[PDB]
Structure 1
Amino acid sequence: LEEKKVCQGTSNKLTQLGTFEDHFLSLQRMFNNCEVVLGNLEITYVQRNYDLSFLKTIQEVAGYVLIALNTVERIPLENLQIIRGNMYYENSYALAVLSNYDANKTGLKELPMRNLQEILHGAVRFSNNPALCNVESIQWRDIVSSDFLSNMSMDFQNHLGSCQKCDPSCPNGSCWGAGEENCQKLTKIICAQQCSGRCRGKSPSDCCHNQCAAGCTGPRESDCLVCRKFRDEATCKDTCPPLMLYNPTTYQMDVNPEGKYSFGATCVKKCPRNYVVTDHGSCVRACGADSYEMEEDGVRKCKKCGPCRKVCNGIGIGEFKDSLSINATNIKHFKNCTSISGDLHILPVAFRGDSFTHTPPLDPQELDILKTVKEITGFLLIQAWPENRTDLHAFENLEIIRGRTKQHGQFSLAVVSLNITSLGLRSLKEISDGDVIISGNKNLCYANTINWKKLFGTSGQKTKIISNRGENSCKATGQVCHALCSPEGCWGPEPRDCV
């Protein structure tokens, strides 16, 4: 009923993306009109005079917040009220503000986060910010969970001096910057004893409902600033209202007319497109070991097997949380999988081996293990392939790519900068959602012959199939679909390569 502009987030830590300007356009593009950040918020390397006003819309950050190596004078995160800290930075921090300046000349001066009332998980660290003003006066015991205040290893300084004292109207001299506007709002340290969560004031009639986070404008549920757990229309619930309720005097399940489904941290009428609906009235991206999927008449719903097909986790989750690609070490686990719950990444590192990560080259022959993979729930990203392999034979049985998860939030299938001459994706019959990009494959010749639209199952799906091998050259060298393929092209020159 009242959405809220949401956006992806980033994980570049302390890396710079090209020039300062380049790096900046990347930032501005990733958070322009964003109110909620599902990932992390990383503001780094911004220089003097670059406007960060677009940052004023950020209200929530799900992961961590990294502010570092910025020389810009002000970072206006004026409305960020919550940092969940689902995922940390450097193992311990939900908020890290580091080395914000250059040669003891200029640096980050003001960070007016006057609404940062809560950090659910993780600690906070400040270091080498010789120009940052006022933050020192902050009482973090009102923002960070007690079970994290001890891991706080901060350290401030005033080697800029152009710092004004907090306004006299502020609490115990606490503020995020000059002005009464930036005084620190307390909501957990000055609360009435008879209270659980945050509070409006110290009055017993001014306490917030337990499901409230940061603060509230009233004593009720629909009166929270930000929700603790789930969010239902305009309410904060510890769990979404079930679709069914047990009846203690019937030993039967009654249908709750006010039930809804769990979708992330929100409750909704019906699950969205391409998600699976469970018996528990929730939307999941992957069923359980015993279940599978059924649709065509309604919505894809899980069920339950015993001859269940083998489901292996994908790069990014499970035992491969910090694994960059399919590699010598992990390729064993994709043993004899038929379906991947998650995504598959194949980067050049897989073939070179990686020191910093103790991984030896992968034997090209090993990839044939993937021939059993018939479906991928997330996305398939191929940035490298064995040098002497003409096509992606190892995936010639891949039938469905669902796109439940996508690269950069957009792509479901990404085949770039390889030397393959044809795709070989003979079984690929459906790309549920997500975009398809097949670019920079200088010798790739059949891509455009396939009618991709015929594989899509969601509106707005598009392709970016350019800059591979020139059509004219493909025709000249006679690399085109076989004679028995008047239909929707082919995945290669071969007869059995035809769609």
Structure 2
Amino acid sequence: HHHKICIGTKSRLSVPSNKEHHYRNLRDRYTNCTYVDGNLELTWLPNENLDLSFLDNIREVTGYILISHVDVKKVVFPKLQIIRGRTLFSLSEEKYALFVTYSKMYTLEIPDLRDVLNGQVGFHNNYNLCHMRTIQWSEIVSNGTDAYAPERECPKCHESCTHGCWGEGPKNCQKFSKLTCSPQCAGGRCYGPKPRECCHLFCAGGCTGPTQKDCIACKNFFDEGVCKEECPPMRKYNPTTYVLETNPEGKYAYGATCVKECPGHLLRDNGACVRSCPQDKMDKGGECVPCNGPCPKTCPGVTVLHAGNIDSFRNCTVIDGNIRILDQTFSGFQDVYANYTMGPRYIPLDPERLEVFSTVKEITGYLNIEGTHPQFRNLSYFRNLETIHGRQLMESMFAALAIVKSSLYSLEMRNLKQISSGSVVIQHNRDLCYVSNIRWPAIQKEPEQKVWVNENLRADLCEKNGTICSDQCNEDGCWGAGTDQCLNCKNFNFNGTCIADCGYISNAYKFDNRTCKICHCN
């Protein structure tokens, strides 16, 4: 539950090549969303006609809000009330929870923004933007600080408005919970001006009554409408019996939220919800469980694969992160640090070096392949890859598997039985063959997961060449030419390959109509 959770974006102040694609992305990400886990960054919307109704249901942002180069006449956050600022946006010193630059909007309307829990508010170079100076940010900003002129003539605030307004009308008056209080409750927010009308110290922003059950938001943990110092533990210690009992009323901690189950992008581990799993712990069914014996070698993923980090994947059985294989992976590239300082140049590497991923069985993030090289033809380096968890996804189309503009001729990764919680995008691979005929729902876990297979090599041109599925695979498809490459087999399945009858291949007993097995028969 949690109504509707979103993942924010990290890619900040970065300019997109296509503006239509970029709008389509933000619309897909934020529609029906109520709670954005991460940063909500609204960048490069130049068209005034664009519909920003995806912001309509957003109520809370855990990270920061960045609004840059938005030219739409009216930017409106109808339901947003809380910006937590757990992560903050700052340039290469000051750190912001709300930051608006180079935007040509006439009005920015957040009529129900009550509290900014961490970081500052900042406005810069917004020539048509107005009313922001009538706001009095000391009320909204948690610390209690005054935070950061237009060209146009600006309409006076509606008569109803006591002090300030976000825009035109009486529904755009700024509400006050902190400054209109009796001194009798220093360090809190009131629902009225009288001395008894103060609110619980746990409240954030506003509040309806005096109890912790009455807050708009919680300065600490939010458990299903109630604010509390701590989340009810999954295991609670018993002082009398000296035993750590299992708690029937237990809940998992997810950020500043208390939840019964945990979001698909996180694993539950010891009463909390973590993205990664401990060194002495095994991922199993979305829970960090103890591994039987030695723990399977889990090494971290990388933002871009290169010569500097390829060795670090030696003997890895699980990759916790993503793999991006780009033209740069084979070409080698000039790295950079956030300092803006020049980084190391990675010695070009050839595709044969990718045999490192041979031991890899699982990738917890997404697998992305956009690299081109004459020798980089199949993707058999991941022939032991079993599942791609979509715990993190690409920014566009929520892709868990994205093969775009690669120099591939076949996939060749059998054993890949499951892409859980993602979409598959395979487009514009001039010579990629089998992708067109694989029915990807068979691999995918939920029918709601989408697939996009476009612009590859014609299925007919693949036929003419003969690079099709073996006459032993069912209608599901295959990863490549081979007999061991079928997704599923319409006849008998033996070892990794598929035969017509267990009569062929000498000794093999048929303990199933769909499978045969090897002997030392009946």
Q: TM-score, normalised by structure 2?
A: 0.79
Counterpart of 1:395 in structure 2 is: 382
The Cα RMSD (Å) is 3.2
Give the Å deviation of 1:449: 4.9
- Paired with 2:344 and 2:374, the residues of 1 have a C-alpha distance of 19
Normalized per residue, which structure has more strand?
A: 2
Counterpart of 1:345 in structure 2 is: 324
Taking a change above 3 Å as real, the CA distance of residues 116 and 308 of structure 1, as seen in their structure-2 partners, is same
Counterpart of 2:349 in structure 1 is: 363
Larger radius of gyration: 2
Taking a change above 3 Å as real, the CA distance of residues 20 and 347 of structure 1, as seen in their structure-2 partners, is closer
8 Å CA contact retained: 1:64, 1:93: yes
Deviations 1:118-142 (A, max 9, x none): 2222222211223322211322222
Aligned counterpart for 2:143 among listed residues 130, 146, 164: 146
Counterpart of 1:239 in structure 2 is: 230
2:266 equivalent to 1:287? no
2:392 equivalent to 1:405? yes
Give the Å deviation of 1:472: 1.5
2:158 equivalent to 1:158? no
Counterpart of 1:260 in structure 2 is: 251
Equivalent position amino acid for 2:319 in 1: I
Aligned counterpart for 2:458 among listed residues 465, 470, 488: 470
Give the Å deviation of 1:294: 4.2
In the alignment of these two chains, the number of paired residues is 473
8 Å CA contact retained: 2:265, 2:392: no
- Paired with 1:23 and 1:341, the residues of 2 have a C-alpha distance of 28
8 Å CA contact retained: 2:281, 2:295: yes
Taking a change above 3 Å as real, the CA distance of residues 406 and 131 of structure 1, as seen in their structure-2 partners, is closer
8 Å CA contact retained: 1:327, 1:359: no
8 Å CA contact retained: 1:27, 1:43: no
8 Å CA contact retained: 2:333, 2:345: yes
Counterpart of 2:60 in structure 1 is: 60
Counterpart of 2:191 in structure 1 is: 200
Counterpart of 2:83 in structure 1 is: 83
Give the Å deviation of 1:475: 1.6
Taking a change above 3 Å as real, the CA distance of residues 495 and 79 of structure 1, as seen in their structure-2 partners, is closer
Runs (5+) with no aligned partner, structure 1: 102-107, 316-322
Aligned counterpart for 1:176 among listed residues 154, 161, 166: 166
Counterpart of 1:437 in structure 2 is: 425
Equivalent position amino acid for 1:291 in 2: K
- Paired with 2:199 and 2:46, the residues of 1 have a C-alpha distance of 38
2:422 equivalent to 1:428? no
- Paired with 1:466 and 1:45, the residues of 2 have a C-alpha distance of 27
Equivalent position amino acid for 1:183 in 2: C
Counterpart of 1:7 in structure 2 is: 6
8 Å CA contact retained: 1:77, 1:113: yes
Counterpart of 2:369 in structure 1 is: 382
2:103 equivalent to 1:112? no
Larger mean CA deviation between 192-201 and 33-42 belongs to 192-201
Counterpart of 1:187 in structure 2 is: 177
Deviations 1:417-449 (A, max 9, x none): 212111121332332332223222221122345
- Paired with 1:454 and 1:45, the residues of 2 have a C-alpha distance of 38
8 Å CA contact retained: 2:322, 2:363: yes
Larger mean CA deviation between 69-78 and 349-358 belongs to 349-358
Taking a change above 3 Å as real, the CA distance of residues 336 and 72 of structure 1, as seen in their structure-2 partners, is same
- State the identity %: 40
Larger mean CA deviation between 354-363 and 440-449 belongs to 354-363
Larger mean CA deviation between 176-185 and 134-143 belongs to 176-185
Counterpart of 1:129 in structure 2 is: 126
Taking a change above 3 Å as real, the CA distance of residues 303 and 407 of structure 1, as seen in their structure-2 partners, is same
Counterpart of 2:504 in structure 1 is: none
Taking a change above 3 Å as real, the CA distance of residues 166 and 377 of structure 1, as seen in their structure-2 partners, is same
Counterpart of 2:203 in structure 1 is: 212
Aligned counterpart for 1:269 among listed residues 251, 257, 260: 260
Give the Å deviation of 1:274: 8.2
Taking a change above 3 Å as real, the CA distance of residues 229 and 367 of structure 1, as seen in their structure-2 partners, is farther
Deviations 1:24-75 (A, max 9, x none): 4554444343332233131543444545455343322222222232333321
Taking a change above 3 Å as real, the CA distance of residues 332 and 213 of structure 1, as seen in their structure-2 partners, is farther
